[PDB]
Write a protein that binds this ligand. Sequence first.
Ligand SMILES: Nc1nc2c(ncn2[C@@H]2O[C@H](COP(=O)(O)OP(=O)(O)OP(=O)(O)O)[C@@H](O)[C@H]2O)c(=O)[nH]1
Ligand SMILES: Nc1nc2c(ncn2[C@@H]2O[C@H](COP(=O)(O)OP(=O)(O)OP(=O)(O)O)[C@@H](O)[C@H]2O)c(=O)[nH]1
Ligand SMILES: Nc1nc2c(ncn2[C@@H]2O[C@H](COP(=O)(O)OP(=O)(O)OP(=O)(O)O)[C@@H](O)[C@H]2O)c(=O)[nH]1
Ligand SMILES: Nc1nc2c(ncn2[C@@H]2O[C@H](COP(=O)(O)OP(=O)(O)OP(=O)(O)O)[C@@H](O)[C@H]2O)c(=O)[nH]1
Ligand SMILES: [Ca+2]
Ligand SMILES: [Ca+2]
Ligand SMILES: [Ca+2]
Ligand SMILES: [Ca+2]
Ligand SMILES: [Mn+2]
Ligand SMILES: [Mn+2]
Ligand SMILES: [Mn+2]
Ligand SMILES: [Mn+2]
Lengths: 440, 440, 440, 441
Amino acid sequence: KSKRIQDPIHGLMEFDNWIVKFIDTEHFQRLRSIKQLGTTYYVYPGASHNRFEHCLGVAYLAHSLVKRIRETQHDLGCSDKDLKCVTLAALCHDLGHGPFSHLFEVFIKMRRPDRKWTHEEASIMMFDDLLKEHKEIAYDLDDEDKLFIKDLITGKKPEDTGNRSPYLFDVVANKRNSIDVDKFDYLARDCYYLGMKSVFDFSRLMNYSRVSDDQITYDFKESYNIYELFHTRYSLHKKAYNHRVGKAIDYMILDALIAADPVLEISKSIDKPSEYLKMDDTILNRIEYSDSDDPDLKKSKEIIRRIRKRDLYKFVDEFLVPKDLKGKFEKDKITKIITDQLEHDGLKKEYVIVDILILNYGKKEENPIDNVKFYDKNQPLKVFKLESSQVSYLVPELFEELNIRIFTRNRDKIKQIRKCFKESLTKFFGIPEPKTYYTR
Amino acid sequence: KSKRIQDPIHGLMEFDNWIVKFIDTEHFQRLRSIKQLGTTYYVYPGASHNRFEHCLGVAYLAHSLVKRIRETQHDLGCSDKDLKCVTLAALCHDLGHGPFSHLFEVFIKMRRPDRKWTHEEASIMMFDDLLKEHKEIAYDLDDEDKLFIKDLITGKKPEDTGNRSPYLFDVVANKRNSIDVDKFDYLARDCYYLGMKSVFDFSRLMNYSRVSDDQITYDFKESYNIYELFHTRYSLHKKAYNHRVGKAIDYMILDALIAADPVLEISKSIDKPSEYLKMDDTILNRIEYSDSDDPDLKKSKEIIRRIRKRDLYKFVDEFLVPKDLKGKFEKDKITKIITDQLEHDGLKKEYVIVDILILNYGKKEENPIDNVKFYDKQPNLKVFKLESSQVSYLVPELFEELNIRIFTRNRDKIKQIRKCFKESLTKFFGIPEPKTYYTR
Amino acid sequence: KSKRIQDPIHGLMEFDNWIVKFIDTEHFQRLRSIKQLGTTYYVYPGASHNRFEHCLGVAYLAHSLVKRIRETQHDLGCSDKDLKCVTLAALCHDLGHGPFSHLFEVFIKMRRPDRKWTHEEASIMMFDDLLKEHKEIAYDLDDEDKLFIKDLITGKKPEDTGNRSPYLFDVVANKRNSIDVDKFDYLARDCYYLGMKSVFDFSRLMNYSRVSDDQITYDFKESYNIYELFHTRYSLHKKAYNHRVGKAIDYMILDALIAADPVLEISKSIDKPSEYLKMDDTILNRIEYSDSDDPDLKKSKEIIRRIRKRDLYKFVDEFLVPKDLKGKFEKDKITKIITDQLEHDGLKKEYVIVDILILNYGKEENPIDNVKFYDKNQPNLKVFKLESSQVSYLVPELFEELNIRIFTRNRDKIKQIRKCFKESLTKFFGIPEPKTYYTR
Amino acid sequence: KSKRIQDPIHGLMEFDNWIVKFIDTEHFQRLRSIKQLGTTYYVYPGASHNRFEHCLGVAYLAHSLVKRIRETQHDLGCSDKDLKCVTLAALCHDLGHGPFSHLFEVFIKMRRPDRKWTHEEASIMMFDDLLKEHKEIAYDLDDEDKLFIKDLITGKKPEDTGNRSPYLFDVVANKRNSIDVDKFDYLARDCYYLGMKSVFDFSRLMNYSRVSDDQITYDFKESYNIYELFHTRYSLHKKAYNHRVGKAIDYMILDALIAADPVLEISKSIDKPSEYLKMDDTILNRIEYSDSDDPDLKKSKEIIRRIRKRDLYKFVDEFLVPKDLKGKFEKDKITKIITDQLEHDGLKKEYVIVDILILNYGKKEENPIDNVKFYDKNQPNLKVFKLESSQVSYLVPELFEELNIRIFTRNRDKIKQIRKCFKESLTKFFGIPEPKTYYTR
Ligand SMILES: Nc1nc2c(ncn2[C@@H]2O[C@H](COP(=O)(O)OP(=O)(O)OP(=O)(O)O)[C@@H](O)[C@H]2O)c(=O)[nH]1
Ligand SMILES: Nc1nc2c(ncn2[C@@H]2O[C@H](COP(=O)(O)OP(=O)(O)OP(=O)(O)O)[C@@H](O)[C@H]2O)c(=O)[nH]1
Ligand SMILES: Nc1nc2c(ncn2[C@@H]2O[C@H](COP(=O)(O)OP(=O)(O)OP(=O)(O)O)[C@@H](O)[C@H]2O)c(=O)[nH]1
Ligand SMILES: Nc1nc2c(ncn2[C@@H]2O[C@H](COP(=O)(O)OP(=O)(O)OP(=O)(O)O)[C@@H](O)[C@H]2O)c(=O)[nH]1
Ligand SMILES: [Ca+2]
Ligand SMILES: [Ca+2]
Ligand SMILES: [Ca+2]
Ligand SMILES: [Ca+2]
Ligand SMILES: [Mn+2]
Ligand SMILES: [Mn+2]
Ligand SMILES: [Mn+2]
Ligand SMILES: [Mn+2]
């Protein structure tokens, strides 16, 4: 009946036999071969964790959070089916992730930019395919139930929630608060495995929440803890997720996948669920260990061998554009002028890689503790909202960061591309003195 | 002939006999009876630690850091005597702390305002008496070495450093960076004992620093870690150090010390070292259990019995002043108006307590990382200071935050003076509807 | 009403309003000044915790355990009244501890050996006085319920459990198994504060237990966890509790209390609860800082100054008896021949101290004795006992250890007393060569 | 030059540039695709770590320890070459590990028992190939240094260590104490990743040791800490390393490997370095993601399919032999009685699996604390001594060598039936009329 999974983050998690059925499926077990942080493992060797174990924690969190809500608020009318759908939604929210997680999206964009593929779109396809091949374990699931699970995976804004337990949309994919149990898991899981520390305490948000006004409301004593949630995500982005060598290795993995695409048809595995079953991170080993004499795979094997020998794409120069010049930036425009500068004075454009780095705290430029409602235990008083002049705390110095990083495929000539970077910056942005991150 | 002391933060601490004899002085062992966090133990039962164990950690960190500097930079001319002086400075930096730690500094502030007594001065007096009664253990120290220890304890600004190893002044009492091993210990110690998490890693700061420009410079990779030093301290202030009930219990202690002062001469103990040797946290127990029928001591026991019954001074409300009204504030000027407001409607002044809270991200109002010089293991020309864009992270919204907190010695008139605080706020130099802490 | 208290081991413990009424009493608040490990703080600086916080954890653990039992086994009939009794028993079990915890028990044994006093008896008396002094609290409990609480504080053998929830006797003071939530707290709290590690995990024993056969049964997969409970207690005794310098300072505190006993009536405070409320660890400070001219206070003050100066009683030698000579041992007899040996061939007998050390793993019982198990894998309701032939794990080399440790009050001579010990061993025991620990 | 690598166990690890060139070889980076705990990840999802990160820590600890010895005991004569040699042994001590670690040894033994191939032999084979294909990075090593490095990986008894710094054999593969920095790392790394606790503190063992009598001696105050090293490893075996379902999936992987061997020739990979370079855990995916219709491949594909659907081999029962009955026991002889009993009154023997579990507190039935020499800081004149019941009392295993007979079934419908045959064959093998198995109540 009930199962028990030992996890370093959540301890011992209990899953009912109903949950276990969807777990013991080739669709979900596929997540064991998909790394949670992609190429971070190649810079932070502790980041070996996969999306499989992360999804178990989100399902455990969502099930127990909704179970606490149902039992403490019996007048809410939340049914057993509502608890089952939110548990399946949490369990299958990352089912559609591809090899190296978000990097597969960039790969498919570079290959088929018109398909507009995204990982949670594949989550819908994989969820349906699991229900088709294992309809026995989903006998109790209705057609309106099946769409409920899919709508919770993607999340809905507070205006288009409907009448099917609107607070349940705050659990897995939060569009109003961005405070969800999925973030509770990976923030702590990645912190644990990267060997990093965090102040945010998700257990207090797990137990000291409540449902009011069709939304999950939190104790007003937890306001600074909610601050530390997005602070942990901000710090994780600034310390590990956006590491420069990790991005250089990311572009090498892309060039390898592109080269091996015509023979293996990697960018086509997303068209069929049967083909997506076999797509995971082991594709890198398949290319590496391929003995074929195809010039595509030979180029792809060379890039993979370059990873193993640490002969990676080197960094050239970085530039943070000021907020005053943010309006003039354009990814396609800045790429053309830079490549023209290499073509005019320099070498081939094949060497240079123009990378864009967008760091957004919260939702765009929105402050923390926005659209979240608070309560007081003493006053059993309507939900309230704290004003900007009522609470102060730590804040990101720059809410929106625009960084134009330059990588070179060839490690021979870096100083010439570094000079060419300043030449392109002074005539696109007009700044006579481009204050690049490598100042003089 | 050394001694290894086991500690939950630093593991096995190694102490040689030259300082062990200093640790085995009744002057140092007095710190066993002075809690590190004063009255925080009454709200956080885990905060049981005292200043004695903290000072052992600081002495351990100062000795190991300076020993590494001596073993890695032989050209600095740092002697074994210089190792002794900075180690002794660390051990005795908190020697002059009184009962309930900083609570005693504000007790003497009322009783003897002209004295302007600080625990840094008592540390000098206590250190002097230590050498007076234990001159057998200070035979190799001259007055120059003695005066060096005094200066290291008080800390000196970079300009007033002299040529007696100016870099050593950054070790125990940093007046330039605020990055000292004292902060290293108690931040890790308080987090461990309070049960709160920290984002700071002091071991990295200990192992990745070098001496240059007559100061302590840090690796560029530790820039984020330096931010998390003050992040951790800020969060600790916002959650534990400045707890409202902690200050409520504080004001009770001050009142009880005031009533017992004409009988016990508590405020006079800071004048003679042999009188100060008998002054610690236990004076509350001595007053509580004393059976004398003195009228001045009767009120002290009544206040102390109020603590045991948790019939404490009740928090009423607090007001976070806006940035625009900071210059419009004056502590003594505003206290007049709430005194006049209470005698109009309500009761007498004896029930209200006005409290000022100054929360500082680092000493005073400045970003402390702007005073840290860094080095990049691509050897830069000289040690450099981080520019505006070289690094961006979590900055405080208000570097200096002023909070007007209102406490009452009567628990029944919580709403009569909650109004009078708002009427005083709205009538003093403010706004039609003040937004205090409990306004919604 | 309900209050939550942060604890570094249990996180956030919630106490109902009826529990807070007991906490907010001078009887219970007295435990704030009763160190959990007595003089261990003088060897392990991290052991600054008190009996106050330990008691909160036992109450939280006991309450949470028995409440989960009723919510999962409704057929048991465990009423809300029984939940109240076992929670109070856990909260007040250590209410009778005196200064330095168990050390005070040895002190009263040496002073009034005919009283046969124990802190449990003082815990009942402190519980009776608490109710007498607070008539407004604890209205639900009747006289029969008051007897139940006292019986749970002392514990009862399975033959005298009665007919009112006999399983509840396993929660606080377990006599048939010794597996209780009291050990769950201090094993973890002492490890945390001493800076030690343990394999035992009380949380697994908390949520995976079942009540049957009028007792508390456990999952048979936790049989090795039960092994590690008693392993952790055995390891804590062998590493911290029984430290040789800890016992040396123990005798110093005892000698000082003896001198001051006629004046201060320390050993007589266990007769009147009103006198016992002022009996806490700060009594050492009142003696140390006394200005009285009585000769015993000077003798008491001189010993305390020896503690601060670290001129402690020096450990001379220690001898472990073999199993075949255990029966030929008697504390009074071996002390006499050692005393007579010092008197004839040596110095004054006041120098030598003869200390017995008994270390029992659990008598000589096996750690899985008398605990019944249920199989969660196969759905079952019957309990079973694991035979010794179907389990194998770690086990102490010596289940019972008897050591004769000798300390001297005079550190001028040691080798002389050490020689008298060896000659007394050959005269009291038939061995010609003494297998002491200071052989070489 | 030097590089700093962040690790959750050791924090920041520094590596000199010469060590980095070995790390950045395809032979070392292959360990990124080999799980440290084999199939344990299928039971404990936190145990996702690979041999690459574990070997990084071991080389870091081995370098730190030996570097300290050279700086605190100049008179020993430990050369830079010696420090280079032991660090390389630590980095390559797991170089020849096959897919799912210890599982591959059983696959070679089952397929080719005459070879008796061990991953130390493959470690030798892949270490020689590492230097052959990267000769520019090993220019300073001579033939004797290579023999020094190779022997440090295996380890040597105290009677077989020469005069070339014999204490260094205690750093990576300790044959006298079993106290090496290999255990220092994976004991902590496995606990951190499985989500389990440990009483051992390897930091104390790293700094409170001293070399004398051609060995590594430990401070007297660390005697309890040493006991907890083997306490932690013993506890890790009883809950994680020897999990029944982990062993059940171990046999599933084996059956699928034998079934796929005629087509993929997996067992031949242990012969040529170039082929073993492609040998890692990913072969589980290549077999299940192939598309050929070979009947041998179809049999292995089904086994992998039952892994994903948790239609695994079911644990039947376990029998701990008594100490008296341990002398009268033989693996091949007891197995015949069980198959004969199942072929008599049951179904075919293809469903039953006979597994013999051997748990050692040390290496065999010796106590490793009896082979470590201790010293005293307050008595430096006193020669290093062994523990001789003088303050030597702690927790020891009841059986220093635990022998367990476990039965697995390939079909879950015959669990109760095979359970009877296990007790039947137990009665006709041992002189025990009523055997008390694991599931007997
Ligand atoms: N070299 C190397 N670094 C690793 C490896 N695994 C994790 N890392 C970490 O990831 C980071 C990658 O940086 P580098 O390997 O130096 O890449 P790079 O900066 O282009 O190379 P350099 O220009 O020589 O510094 C390193 O600093 C390591 O801390 C590995 O296998 N090899
Ligand atoms: N001296 C001293 N030791 C402390 C103190 N706090 C904790 N300890 C620990 O207590 C242990 C025992 O104290 P010792 O000073 O060694 O007592 P002792 O063994 O009788 O004295 P010695 O003759 O110097 O060895 C030491 O090893 C320290 O690790 C302290 O404040 N002073
Ligand atoms: N009452 C009480 N609280 C404690 C104690 N120890 C720690 N605390 C914590 O300290 C916090 C302070 O709250 P209270 O003691 O109730 O003080 P208060 O808020 O002024 O009192 P109330 O108005 O009744 O809430 C509590 O929330 C507890 O979590 C204790 O011994 N008694
Ligand atoms: N079912 C299942 N168990 C897992 C999984 N991952 C880890 N485990 C753990 O492995 C343990 C044993 O696996 P089980 O699925 O129970 O397989 P089994 O014990 O041989 O057979 P059953 O208990 O009848 O299901 C479980 O108790 C889980 O804690 C998983 O993905 N599915
Ligand atoms: Ca309150
Ligand atoms: Ca000593
Ligand atoms: Ca099972
Ligand atoms: Ca680099
Ligand atoms: Mn996710
Ligand atoms: Mn300090
Ligand atoms: Mn207790
Ligand atoms: Mn290894």
